[PDB]
Amino acid sequence: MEGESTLGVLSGFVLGALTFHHLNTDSDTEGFLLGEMKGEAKNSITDS
């Protein structure tokens, strides 16, 4: 198997908050991202 993808997901508001924190900082800025990572299985069918 080992058929693995690694999609990333966000919400509009979190990107807005990062953008806001940045626009207030007159320099580079940085921080940490907290969330959860979950694997989903799709048993694709090919012809028959």
Partner 1 sequence: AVQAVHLESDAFLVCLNHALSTEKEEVMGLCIGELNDDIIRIVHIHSVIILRRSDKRKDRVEISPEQLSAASTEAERLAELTGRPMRVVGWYHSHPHITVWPSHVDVRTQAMYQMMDQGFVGLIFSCFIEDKNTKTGRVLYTCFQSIQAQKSSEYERIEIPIHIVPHITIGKVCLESAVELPKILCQEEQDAYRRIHSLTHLDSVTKIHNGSVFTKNLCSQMSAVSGPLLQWLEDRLEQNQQHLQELQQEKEELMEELSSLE
Centroid of chain to Cα 40: 15
Distance CA 16, CA 12 (A): 6
Near partner 1 by CB under 8 A: residue from 2, 26, 30, 47: 47
Binding string, 7-46, against partner 1, x = CB under 8 A?
--------------------------------------x-
3-class DSSP state of 1: coil
Distance CA 27, CA 35 (A): 26
Q: Least Å distance between CB 45 and partner 1?
A: 6
Q: Which spans of this chain sit near partner 1 (rule: CB under 8 A)?
A: 45, 47-48
